[PDB]
């Protein structure tokens, strides 16, 4: 922010998208939140890991119950995938290069399958890909514009890799650690980015994703309370309790300066 003018970067945009659950996806979410397992967890009986993981999987896609054009991970069954198809269409028609992120490897595989269903030229990288081949792949994608979309797991997709070659970035799935999201979305807007970039972070409105978004908002508030300034406004969008299982879909000093500073410290 204080170096951009002295560095001549292009413009950036931070649009956040609030998706709508599909009928099947909404039904699955409603079924699961009405299950007995979540009731047991809310009673403290069982570990909270399982319910959270299941909800994340559902919101990413109804892959719990693998439902032609009905193969496992069919794009129209998850609203986020429909919106992603729309955006990929628009950007491919706009001749832009897109960056596609995801937290989970399996949803990355479903996304790859959908991309193969389309004609888009993709190029994927996760922990599975051999390390020796990774930097070559980065060089390739930053080299040729033929590859339209780049698939990544955020745990390797972020973390110091330079992907100025891409133009557009979409964050499919949120996470508990906002730093992951920031690193991913900063994979594009770096030194050498010669085109305007815009960020699209996908959240299923009124679901677990919105609650995780609130939590990580509170986290940026905590961090900015010390790194940027101490006058940080109090987080108020949520009280951050354990009711995120619910479905709420929308619709030299001279001995005077020292004394004065110290009094000021004492009068807070």
């Amino acid at each position: 922010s204080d170096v951009k003018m002295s560095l001549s970067l292009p413009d950036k945009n931070e649009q956040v998208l609030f998706c709508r659950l599909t009928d099947e996806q909404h039904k699955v979410y409603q079924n699961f939140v009405d299950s007995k397992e979540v009731y047991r967890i809310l009673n403290g009986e069982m570990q909270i890991f399982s319910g959270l993981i299941a909800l994340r999987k559902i919101c990413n896609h109804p892959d719990l119950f693998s439902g032609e054009e009905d193969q496992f991970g069919y794009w129209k069954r998850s609203g986020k995938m429909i919106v992603v198809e729309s955006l990929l269409k628009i950007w491919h028609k706009q001749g832009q290069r897109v960056l596609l992120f995801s937290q989970s490897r399996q949803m990355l595989d479903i996304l790859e399958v959908f991309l193969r269903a389309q004609k888009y030229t993709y190029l994927k990288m996760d922990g599975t890909t051999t390390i020796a081949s990774r930097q070559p792949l980065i060089t390739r994608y930053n080299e040729d514009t033929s590859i339209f979309v780049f698939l990544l797991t955020t745990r390797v997709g972020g973390l110091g890799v330079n992907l100025t070659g891409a133009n557009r970035v979409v964050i499919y799935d949120p996470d508990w650690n906002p730093s992951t999201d920031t690193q991913a979305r900063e994979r594009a807007w770096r030194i050498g980015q010669k085109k305007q970039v815009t960020v699209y972070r996908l959240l299923t409105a009124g679901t677990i994703e919105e609650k995780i978004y609130h939590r990580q908002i509170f986290k940026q508030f905590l961090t900015n309370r010390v790194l940027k300034d101490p006058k940080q406004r109090r987080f108020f969008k949520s009280n951050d309790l354990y009711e995120l299982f619910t479905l709420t879909s929308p619709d030299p000093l001279a001995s005077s300066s020292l004394l004065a500073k110290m009094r000021a410290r004492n009068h807070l």
């Binding site: 030299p252 000093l253 001995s255 500073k261 009094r263």
Partner: protein, 365 residues
Amino acid sequence: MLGFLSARQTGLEDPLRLRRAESTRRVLGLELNKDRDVERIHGGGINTLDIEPVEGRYMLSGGSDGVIVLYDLENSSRQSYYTCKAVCSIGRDHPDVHRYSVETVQWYPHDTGMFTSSSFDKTLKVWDTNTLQTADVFNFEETVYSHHMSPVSTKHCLVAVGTRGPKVQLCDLKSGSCSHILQGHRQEILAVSWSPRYDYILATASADSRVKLWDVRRASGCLITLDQHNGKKSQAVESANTAHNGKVNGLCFTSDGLHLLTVGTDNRMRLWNSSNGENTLVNYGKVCNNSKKGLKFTVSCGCSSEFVFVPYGSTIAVYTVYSGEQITMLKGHYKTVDCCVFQSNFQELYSGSRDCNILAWVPSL
């Protein structure tokens, strides 16, 4: 003495010669107050005294009964014989008196508009010279045995605090951050001192019987490790390995921060070089201390040969720092002496003991 005046007038000898010769001759002839008497205000023993650095006029004093008294030393009366009045006081009725004996009290160097004080109630209050109100406090988890502000730092304003915990705290007065601790010691820390020469070199000593010269900028514990026998081998950072065989409850850098004098409960004193911690084998004989808490002493400045005024039982014992001669003994107290200060302007000594007295030793003739 007339010869010095002749030489000085003729330009034979630099005035330096007369100045330092006369200062020494005054220090040798020191003896109990012919022409002073310190007003009595303390109900208990006096734990500390601190004559101000600039102009050397006012003298704080911290009693064992929680009261601080601020003195005036200049003979404002017209008589040859006078008394040192008390200007103000943090009495027992002040809303901010310490609940217990005051263990250390120190003027703010570079400006008399402040003074710091510490006490066994685990508090280090930072007063105002003029308004006389505690403009801060640092509350600690264990009793505060001693503190010391750097005497030369124009940049930093840290305040080393040696408490009954094995962690040397470094509070700051610029925005107050009492988090810092120097890891490495092993038991209580009975004394701490800042170098007068180098800004950041802090030397602390602990009841586990070793002194350790830290550098407070580094991140590598301590620099030097003081060892009685200064053998070939080296050690890591601990309080172990016996600078003295018993508790070390005393520290004083000599006037210009080269060497380092340490008294300890094993009835010995040792002069160590402070560049390499090299015990310089000066000895001083058998100096009696058995104080269970900090032991304050001082060294003269502006004298031809450098002395040290070390309490010795109820007597102040004067030694020559570099030669170990016992110049004399001052015998004027009735209980153990606990702190002595030196007035470098006129070569005068003030001494405070458990007997609730602050005596003045002035040169005779």
